[PDB]
UniProtKB/Swiss-Prot annotation:
This is Chloride intracellular channel protein 1. GO terms for cellular component: blood microparticle; brush border; chloride channel complex; cytoplasm; endoplasmic reticulum; extracellular exosome; extracellular space; membrane. The modification S-glutathionyl cysteine is found at C19. Its EC number is 1.8.-.-, 1.8.5.1. Residues 88-228 form the GST C-terminal domain. Changing C19S: Loss of dimerization and of ion transport activity. It is found in: Nucleus; Nucleus membrane; Cytoplasm; Cell membrane. GO terms for biological process: chloride transport; platelet aggregation; positive regulation of osteoblast differentiation; regulation of mitochondrial membrane potential; signal transduction. Optimally active at neutral to slightly alkaline pH. It comes from Homo sapiens. Belongs to the chloride channel CLIC family. Changing C54A: Loss of glutathione-dependent oxidoreductase activity. CDD domains: GST_C_CLIC1 (cd10300), GST_N_CLIC (cd03061).
């Protein structure tokens, strides 16, 4: 069946807008290997076709054949269920812990970036750093080794590329768009970076930036920053 993902447009009404849900679903479709369209929607000037498909204005939404699906979590679950083996790869993580690691970071970032009081900034910075460290601990703790790596048993070096192993999973599709926003926005508006001491987080992001499924689905830095001009507050 025809597959079409509709996502909120950015500042010019044409490019993909900042939205971690849009990027998540783009990543899931890309990783499945299915043929699909991505189309943007300017909410201030929606096309007639879009107004008829999604009268309620929900975004992102997915057209699968002639049927419209809304709610990012429900869309993802649906895609995982219908684009399944043997024709398409299963993308669900094998370890439930992969689906909870780092889940709290984005809301801690939001609280941090939306604050304007200088002293309170420092409490919020600590909350964000603690959440990033808990993710770092997950990324540096071992999981069963994939069949394409033998270093753990051969040399004593346990390593993996992503949250759950050496392949991108649904968990990474949720988390990576959010971490990317955290990075770009915190650098711009706070001069804050994820500490180099968090090796797990840095190795993960390096490995992810080397995959087009992630790198190519990121909005450009200026667009992300622009989307935060009425969200981020100056101290």
């Amino acid at each position: 069946p025809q597959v079409e993902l509709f996502v909120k447009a950015g500042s010019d009404g044409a490019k993909i807008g900042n939205c971690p849900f849009s990027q998540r679903l783009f990543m899931v479709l890309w990783l499945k290997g299915v043929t699909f369209n991505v189309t943007t929607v300017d909410t201030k000037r929606r096309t007639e076709t879009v107004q008829k498909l999604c009268p309620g204005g929900e975004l992102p939404f997915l057209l699968y054949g002639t049927e419209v699906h809304t709610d990012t979590n429900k869309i993802e679950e649906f895609l995982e269920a219908v684009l399944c083996p043997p024709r398409y790869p299963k993308l669900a993580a094998l370890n439930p812990e992969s689906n909870t690691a780092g889940l709290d970071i984005f809301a801690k970032f939001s609280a941090y970036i939306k604050n304007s009081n200088p002293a309170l900034n420092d409490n919020l910075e600590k909350g964000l750093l603690k959440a990033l460290k808990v993710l770092d601990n997950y990324l540096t703790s071992p999981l069963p080794e994939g069949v394409d790596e033998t270093s753990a048993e051969d040399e004593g070096v346990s390593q993996r590329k992503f949250l759950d192993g050496n392949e991108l999973t649904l968990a990474d599709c949720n988390l990576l768009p959010k971490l990317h926003i955290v990075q770009v926005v915190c650098k711009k508006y706070r001069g804050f970076t994820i500490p180099e001491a968090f090796r797990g987080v840095h190795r993960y992001l390096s490995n992810a930036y080397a995959r087009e499924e992630f790198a190519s689905t990121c909005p450009d830095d200026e667009e992300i920053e622009l989307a935060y001009e009425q969200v981020a507050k100056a101290l």
